[PDB]
RNA sequence: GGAUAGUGGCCUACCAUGGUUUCAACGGGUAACGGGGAAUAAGGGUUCGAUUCCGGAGAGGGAGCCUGAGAAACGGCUACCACAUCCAAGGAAGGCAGCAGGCGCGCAAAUUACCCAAUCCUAAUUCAGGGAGGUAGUGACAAUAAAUAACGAUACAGGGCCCAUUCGGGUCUUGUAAUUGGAAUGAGUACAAUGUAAAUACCUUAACGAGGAACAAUUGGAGGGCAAGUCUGGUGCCAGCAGCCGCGGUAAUUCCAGCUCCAAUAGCGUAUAUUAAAGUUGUUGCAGUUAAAAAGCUCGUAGUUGAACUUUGGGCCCGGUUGGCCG
C-alpha cells in the first residue's frame, strides 16, 4: 500500500504488548536534554510471515517481531523504549558510501508531491538514496 | 410621494426592483454567482494543503522596509499557482523545498492585508506540524 | 433515531464587551457574592433579560386578559415564592424593575453568610462545595440552591457532616493516630 | 521590481537575543481567591489616587 | 412506499396516550381492527403505563393468552388490538370493569364500570343499505354489523347491542335536546345538547352544541355521539362530567383541594 | 445496615398474575448501601413470603447516602414466581442458571452454514470423505 | 376502440386547428428533495435547512421481467455499458449511498466490540430472530453544573472615637508579610453495596489520599478604537510587528527577551460563510443640482393610481361589563 509499511525489529528485553504507550528514541536522541523523542503508542503487533498480516497481541523478549504504528516517525534507525534512560545503540556502518549520482527530472506536470513520496518510500524500504 | 410606487396591489411591481436592484450588494453576487466556486482558487472552504514549489521574497510598498520571505505553494485540489506569506518570524528555516504545507486566509475575505502585495494566503500548518508551536519549542518537526 | 434531547444555552455576551465601568460594576457584585467566573453572573443575567421580556408581553394586553391575569398570577406566584418580590407589592411592576441585587441575595451562599454558619464569602464556597451543609434531610453540593424562603427553616449542619457530630475527620484522624 | 529578494536574514533577531530563563515566582491562586484578590487591589487596597485611577504605575 | 407500512416510531405518534420520549424509539404500532390507527389506543400502553399492572412487554403478552382480558365480551390475545371508544374490557378476576371513554381533559379515561353496564354497549352507526338478497344492515363505528333493523333507524343514530349474540337492544333518534358526546377536532370531550344544525349541503355537517353552563362551541357531525336526551343519559359519565372549566379554575381548583 | 427500617410505598394487589408490585423505599443511615438479598430476607415476613418469593430491582443509590430507593415483587408461590418472572433475575439470587450458548456470533456463522447446506448433510459427507481421499 | 383495478391522448383510427405566453410561457444552471425547522436580532427582515419527524427518489448508469395481496425489488433475476475475484484455461461467482472496517479524495469526520437485557417488528407465533435497536470504546462537534483552596494567632500601616495624664494605650478594624498554626473535602486510588445479560460508568462509603520543590491553568495584548508600562536589555527601516491607522533609518510607550498588568477561563485564538451592526438594500425605512445617479424630448401598450354623490339622524323599551351611597 501506500505509506503504511510495517517496521521489522527484534526484541531483546521486555515483553512488547499491542496498545502500549511507547518512547520512541532516535539516532540523534540523548539522555541529556530534549530530542526526536516521542510518546506515541504502538497500533498493533503484526507477525511477518509469506505476505499476510498476523494479530498477535503480545510477543515476549528474545524474539524477532515486526511492530504497525510507526514508519511516520522514524527515518531510517531507531529504537522504542519506554525506559527513562534507555541508551541507544552504537550506529550501523553501511557498505558503501553513495559516489554514483544522477540529476532526476520530470517533463510531466507538477508532480512533485508523487516524486518526494516515492524517494521517501525508497528511502525507508533499504538503505536507499539518502 | 418618494418615487417608489405605493399601490395596494403593486407587490409584484415593488418586487421586481428589490430583484435587480439589490444585485449591487457585494454581499449579493459573490455568493450566487459561483465567483469563490470557479473564480477564488480556494474553492469556498476554510483550509487548504499545499506543495512549495520555490522560495521567494516580495519588499514592501509605500513609506516601509521589509523582505517578507514569502513561499510559493500548489494546492492539491484545483493544481493552480497560489503565492503564500509565512505570518511568522524565523520560519523559514524551518520550511524547506518539496514541503507539504497547510494554508488558509488572512481574515481579509480576498485582498492583501498590508504592505505585502498579492499575498492572500497565510501558512497554518507544515508537515502535520504548526509553525506556532515551532517557535514556542513545544513540538519539533519530523524530518520526513 | 431516538428522540433529540433538548439543550440550550443560560448566558448571552454582551454587544458592547469592552467598557471600563461595566467591569468595575460586575467585579463589585461578583467579588461582593463569591463568584470564581464570569459565566454565572451572565447566567442569571440572561433570566434578568428573559423574565423582564417574558413579563413584557403581558403589559402588551389590556387589563383582566385571561392570559395576562393566569401567566401574571403565576408569575408573581413564582416570583414570590423564591422571594425576589416583597409580598405587598405584588403588582407586576416591580418586576421589571428587579434588578441584579434581588436575584443574586437569594443565592444559597448569600442566605449561609446571612444565618452566619461560614463568617466568610468565600468560606460559605468552601463549606458548600465539600456538601458539609444540608437543607431538610437531602445535603446539596451545588453552591446556587435560589432557597424560596421555605426551606429556609432547615439550612443546617447535615448529620452526616464532620463538624456536626459523626466522624471526627480524615485529617485528623492521621493527627490523633500519630 | 525584484521577486529572489535575499533569503539570509530570516531568524537574526531570534538568534541574537540574549537568553535569560523564567525567574520563580510564588504561586497564584486560581479561581474564586483570584477574584477576591482583584477584590482587595482595586477598590479595597488600591494605592495610587493622584487624580485618576491608574492600574500599573511606573517609575517615576 | 412499495406497499403498506407496518411500524410506528416514537414521534409521529399521536399526543391522546401520553407516551414518553426516552423509552425507546418507537411504538407499541396497533394492528388493524374496529378502529384507526390514529383513533385507537393500543393493549400494551393500556396495561403498562396507564393502568400499571405491568412492568414489562413480554409481561403483557403471557397476560392476554393465559384468558383474563375479555374484550367486547370475547376473549382476544393480541398485543397489538386498536382498542377505541365504547369498548369493555372484562375481568374474570379483580372484578373490575373497564369501558374507555374521552375524558374532560381530551384523552382517554380510566373509568370503572359495573358488570351489569358492562353487559350493553352502545355504538354509532354509519351506513344502513339493503345488502345481497335486499336484507338491511347496518354498521357500527367499530364496524361490526347487524343486519334487519327497525326502518325508523336512520343514519347518524344509536343503537344498544346486547354484546352476548350481537343484536341490537335499543335506538336512540337523533333530534333537538339529546345529550351528545364529542368525539374528535380540538374541543373534544365535552357533552352537551343539541338543539339545531345548518345542513350546509357541501360536505362536512355542521352542528352548535351548548355545555351545561351556556358554554356553546361548534364541532363537525362526524365527531358527536349521542348519548341520551336532555337529562337521562343513558351510561355513566366520568367524572367532571366534561364541563371544561377556565383554565384559571383548574389552578383555584386545585389551591381548594390542597 | 443498622436500623433499615424498610418502609412501602404504593402496595397495590394484582390478583391477574398473582404478584403485588411496590415501590419500596429505605433509610441506611451511617452506611454505604443495603445488599440486595438482605432487602429479600426482611420482606418474605413482612407479606407472609419466604426468601425466594420475593424479587427487586433497582436502589439507585441518592446523592449523599443514606435513602435509596427501588422497586420490588413478591411472588406467592415459587413454581409461580418461575413462568412468570424472565430468566435474568432469576439466575441472579439462585433460581436459574444460564448455560452459555457459545456465543453470538458464533451461532450466526453455523446457522449461515447451515443454510449453505441443503439437507441434513452426512450424505455430503461421505461423499466427499471418498473423493478427498486421495 | 384497446389496456389498467379504475377516469384520462395512456396508446391507436378519423375529424377540427387548436393549447400556453411580458400577470415572465419556453429555455440555462442551481456548491436546489421539499416541508415540519435552525441561526440572528424592537418590529420588519436575511441566510441555511442532506441531517433525529412526515411525505418523495436511488441500491453503479439504463431497459425488461419473475413470484408475490403488496416490487419494475437489485442483501431477486436477464441483455449492454465501466470495473473486478478465482483459477490445475472449460467457466463460475459480483454489486457496502445496510454495520463495522479498507483504499483514493478531501480542511474535514470513530471500534473490523458486546448484548437482544431494554422500545418494538416478523413467523406456524410467549420460547426464535432482527449490526432494527440498546450498551460499551474513540471523541474539546456542539450544550449544563463545577476543581486548582478557605480560616485563626504575631510585625507593620491604618479610621471613625475614649482618655487630653507627655508622639502613650489604643481597646473594633482592612490589607501587606524571605511568620507560624490547626480544621476541610475533592481529583486520583476501590474493601464493599447498588448499576448493568454480564459488565464499564454516577453516587454512597473500610482504608490511602496538600503546608508548596508541591496534587503547579492556559490562550492574546499592553499607541488609538481596544481596560492593560513613557519598566529593563538586545537589533537598528535589516530582522520585523500590524485585521485598519500606523512604529523600526543606534534614546522602539507597537520588533525580540525578563517583571507587572489587563480580558476570558478549561477555555482561548486563527481561517471561511451568514446575521445585527446596515437608515450600506430603505414596504415599514435610502439618495438622485454640486458626494455615484432624472432616460434629450414627446406619444403610447401592459401595469399602477383614480371626482364628489346613494342611511344621515330622532325617539320608545329590554337585558349584559366597570366601579359607586348603603360594608
Given at each position: 500500500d501506500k505509506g503504511r509499511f510495517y517496521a521489522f525489529g527484534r526484541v531483546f528485553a521486555g515483553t512488547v504488548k499491542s496498545g502500549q504507550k511507547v518512547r520512541i528514541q532516535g539516532?540523534?536522541?540523548?539522555?541529556?536534554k530534549k530530542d526526536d523523542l516521542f510518546i506515541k503508542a504502538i497500533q498493533r503487533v503484526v507477525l511477518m510471515m509469506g505476505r499476510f498480516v498476523e494479530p498477535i497481541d503480545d510477543c515476549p523478549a528474545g524474539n524477532i517481531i515486526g511492530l504497525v504504528?510507526?514508519?511516520?516517525?522514524?527515518?531510517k534507525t531507531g529504537t522504542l523504549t519506554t525506559?527513562?534512560?534507555?541508551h541507544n545503540m552504537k550506529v550501523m556502518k553501511f557498505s558503501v558510501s553513495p559516489v554514483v549520482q544522477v540529476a532526476v527530472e520530470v517533463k510531466?506536470?507538477?508532480?512533485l508531491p508523487k516524486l518526494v513520496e516515492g524517494l521517501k518510500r525508497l528511502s525507508k524500504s533499504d538503505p536507499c538514496v539518502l | 410621494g418618494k418615487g417608489k410606487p405605493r399601490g395596494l396591489n403593486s407587490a409584484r411591481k415593488l418586487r421586481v426592483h428589490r430583484r435587480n436592484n439589490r444585485?449591487?450588494?457585494?454581499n449579493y453576487k459573490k455568493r450566487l454567482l459561483g465567483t469563490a466556486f470557479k473564480?477564488?482558487?480556494?474553492?469556498?472552504?476554510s483550509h487548504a494543503k499545499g506543495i512549495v514549489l520555490e522560495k521567494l521574497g516580495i519588499e514592501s510598498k509605500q513609506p516601509n522596509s521589509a523582505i517578507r520571505k514569502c513561499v510559493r505553494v500548489q494546492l492539491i485540489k484545483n493544481g493552480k499557482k497560489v503565492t503564500a506569506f509565512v505570518?511568522?518570524?524565523?520560519?523559514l528555516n524551518f520550511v524547506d523545498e518539496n514541503d507539504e504545507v497547510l494554508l488558509a486566509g488572512?481574515?481579509?475575505?480576498?485582498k492583501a492585508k498590508g504592505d505585502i502585495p498579492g499575498v492572500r494566503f497565510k501558512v497554518v500548518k507544515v508537515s502535520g506540524v504548526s509553525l506556532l508551536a515551532l517557535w514556542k519549542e513545544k513540538k519539533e518537526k519530523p524530518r520526513s | 433515531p431516538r428522540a433529540p434531547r433538548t439543550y440550550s444555552k443560560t448566558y448571552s455576551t454582551p454587544?458592547?464587551?469592552?467598557e471600563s465601568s461595566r467591569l468595575d460594576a460586575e467585579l463589585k457584585l461578583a467579588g461582593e457574592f463569591g463568584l470564581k467566573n464570569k459565566k454565572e453572573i451572565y447566567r442569571i443575567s440572561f433570566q434578568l433579560s428573559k423574565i423582564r421580556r417574558a413579563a413584557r408581553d403581558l403589559l402588551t394586553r389590556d387589563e383582566k386578559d385571561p392570559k395576562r391575569l393566569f401567566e401574571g398570577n403565576a408569575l408573581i406566584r413564582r416570583l414570590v415564592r423564591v422571594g425576589v418580590?416583597?409580598?405587598?407589592?405584588?403588582?407586576?411592576?416591580y418586576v421589571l424593575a428587579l434588578k441584579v441585587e434581588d436575584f443574586l441575595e437569594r443565592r444559597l451562599q448569600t442566605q449561609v453568610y446571612k444565618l452566619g454558619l461560614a463568617k466568610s464569602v468565600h468560606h460559605a464556597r468552601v463549606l458548600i462545595t465539600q456538601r458539609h451543609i444540608a437543607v431538610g434531610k437531602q445535603i446539596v453540593?451545588?453552591?446556587?440552591?435560589?432557597?424560596?424562603?421555605?426551606?429556609?427553616?432547615?439550612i443546617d449542619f447535615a448529620p452526616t457532616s464532620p463538624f456536626g457530630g459523626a466522624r471526627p475527620g480524615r485529617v485528623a484522624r492521621r493527627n490523633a493516630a500519630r | 521590481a525584484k521577486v529572489h529578494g535575499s533569503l539570509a536574514r530570516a531568524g537574526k533577531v531570534k538568534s541574537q537575543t540574549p537568553k535569560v530563563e523564567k525567574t520563580e515566582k510564588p504561586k497564584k491562586p486560581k479561581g474564586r481567591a483570584y477574584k477576591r484578590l482583584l477584590y482587595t487591589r482595586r477598590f479595597?487596597?488600591?494605592?495610587?489616587?493622584?487624580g485618576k485611577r491608574r492600574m500599573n504605575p511606573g517609575p517615576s | 412506499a412499495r406497499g403498506p407500512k407496518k411500524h410506528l416510531k416514537?414521534?409521529?405518534?399521536?399526543?391522546?396516550?401520553?407516551l414518553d420520549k426516552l423509552?425507546?424509539?418507537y411504538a407499541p404500532r396497533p394492528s388493524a381492527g374496529p378502529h384507526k390507527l390514529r383513533e385507537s389506543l393500543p393493549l400494551i400502553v393500556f396495561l403498562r403505563?396507564?393502568?400499571?399492572?405491568?412492568?414489562?412487554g413480554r409481561e403483557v403478552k403471557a397476560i392476554l393468552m393465559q384468558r383474563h382480558v375479555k374484550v367486547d365480551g370475547k376473549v382476544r390475545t393480541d398485543t397489538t388490538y386498536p382498542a377505541g371508544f365504547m369498548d369493555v374490557i372484562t375481568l374474570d378476576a379483580t372484578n373490575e370493569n373497564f369501558r374507555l371513554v374521552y375524558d374532560v381533559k381530551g384523552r382517554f379515561a380510566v373509568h370503572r364500570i359495573t358488570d351489569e353496564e358492562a353487559s350493553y354497549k352502545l355504538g354509532k352507526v354509519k351506513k344502513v343499505q339493503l345488502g345481497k338478497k335486499g336484507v338491511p344492515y347496518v354498521v357500527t363505528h367499530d364496524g361490526r354489523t347487524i343486519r334487519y333493523?327497525?326502518?325508523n333507524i336512520k343514519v347518524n343514530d344509536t343503537v344498544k347491542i346486547?354484546?352476548?349474540?350481537?343484536?341490537?337492544t335499543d335506538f336512540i333518534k337523533f333530534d333537538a335536546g339529546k345529550l351528545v358526546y364529542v368525539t374528535g377536532?380540538?374541543?373534544?370531550g365535552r357533552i352537551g345538547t343539541i338543539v339545531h344544525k345548518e345542513?350546509?349541503?357541501?360536505?362536512?355537517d355542521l352542528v352548535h352544541i351548548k355545555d351545561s353552563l351556556d358554554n356553546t362551541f361548534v364541532t363537525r357531525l362526524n365527531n358527536v355521539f349521542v348519548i341520551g336526551e336532555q337529562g337521562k343519559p343513558y351510561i355513566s359519565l366520568?367524572?367532571?362530567?366534561?364541563?371544561?372549566?377556565?383554565?384559571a379554575e383548574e389552578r383555584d381548583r386545585r389551591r381548594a383541594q390542597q | 445496615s443498622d436500623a433499615v427500617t424498610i418502609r412501602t410505598r404504593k402496595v397495590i394487589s394484582n390478583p391477574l398474575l398473582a404478584r403485588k408490585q411496590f415501590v419500596v423505599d429505605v433509610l441506611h443511615p451511617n452506611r454505604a448501601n443495603v445488599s440486595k438479598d438482605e432487602l429479600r430476607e426482611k420482606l418474605a415476613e413482612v407479606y407472609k413470603a419466604?426468601?425466594?418469593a420475593v424479587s427487586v430491582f433497582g436502589?439507585?443509590?441518592?446523592?449523599?447516602?443514606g435513602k435509596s430507593v427501588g422497586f420490588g415483587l413478591v411472588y406467592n408461590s415459587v413454581a409461580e414466581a418461575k413462568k412468570f418472572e424472565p430468566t435474568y433475575r432469576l439466575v441472579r439470587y439462585g433460581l436459574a442458571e444460564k448455560v452459555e450458548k457459545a456465543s453470538r456470533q458464533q451461532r450466526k456463522q453455523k446457522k449461515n452454514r447451515d443454510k449453505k447446506?441443503?439437507?441434513?448433510?452426512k450424505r455430503l459427507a461421505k461423499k466427499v470423505a471418498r473423493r478427498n481421499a486421495d
Open positions: 539516532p540523534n536522541y540523548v539522555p541529556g504504528g510507526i514508519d511516520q516517525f522514524l527515518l525506559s527513562e534512560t534507555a510531466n506536470a507538477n508532480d | 444585485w449591487a450588494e457585494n473564480s477564488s482558487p480556494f474553492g469556498g472552504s505570518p511568522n518570524d524565523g520560519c488572512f481574515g481579509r475575505k480576498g | 454587544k458592547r464587551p469592552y418580590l416583597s409580598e405587598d407589592k405584588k403588582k407586576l411592576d453540593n451545588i453552591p446556587s440552591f435560589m432557597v424560596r424562603l421555605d426551606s429556609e427553616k432547615h | 479595597v487596597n488600591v494605592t495610587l489616587v493622584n | 416514537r414521534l409521529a405518534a399521536p399526543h391522546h396516550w401520553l423509552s425507546g424509539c403505563n396507564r393502568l400499571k399492572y405491568a412492568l414489562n333493523p327497525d326502518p346486547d354484546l352476548a349474540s350481537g343484536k341490537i377536532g380540538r374541543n373534544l345542513r350546509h349541503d357541501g360536505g362536512f366520568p367524572k367532571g362530567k366534561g364541563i371544561k372549566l377556565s383554565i | 419466604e426468601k425466594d436502589f439507585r443509590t441518592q446523592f449523599g447516602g447446506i441443503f439437507g441434513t448433510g
